[PDB]
Amino acid sequence: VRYEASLRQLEQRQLAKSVISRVQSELGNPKFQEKVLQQSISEIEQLLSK
């Protein structure tokens, strides 16, 4: 049980660093531009609801 649990944690941190790699992948894109448009309209929706 102890080594099994340790392995679940080890797997989780390995796959965690892959999430970091996916973050680096997202931030390159001109999705960096295109989602700003999404944020722009989202803030329009938010502040109009105020």
């Binding site: 102890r2 797997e11 390995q14 796959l15 992948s25 997202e26 989602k35 944020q39 989202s42």
Partner: protein, 62 residues
């Protein structure tokens, strides 16, 4: 949004990392069960002892 992008992309596109089951076995022990350690035996067998003890033991005084 970014939440969706990160979630979808990460989860889908990265499925696990290698792991070694053999190494897991290495750090644990399967344990096979101990079999018959020692068998009881006849206590102080040989009535050489018995006659000796009856005759010798008499520590009562005069």
């Amino acid at each position: 949004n970014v939440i969706q992008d990160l979630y979808l992309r990460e989860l889908k596109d990265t499925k696990l990392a290698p792991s070694t089951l053999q190494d897991a076995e290495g750090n644990v022990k399967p344990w096979n069960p101990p079999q018959k350690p020692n068998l009881p035996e006849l206590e102080l067998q040989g009535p050489e002892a018995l006659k000796a003890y009856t005759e010798q033991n008499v520590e009562t005084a005069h």
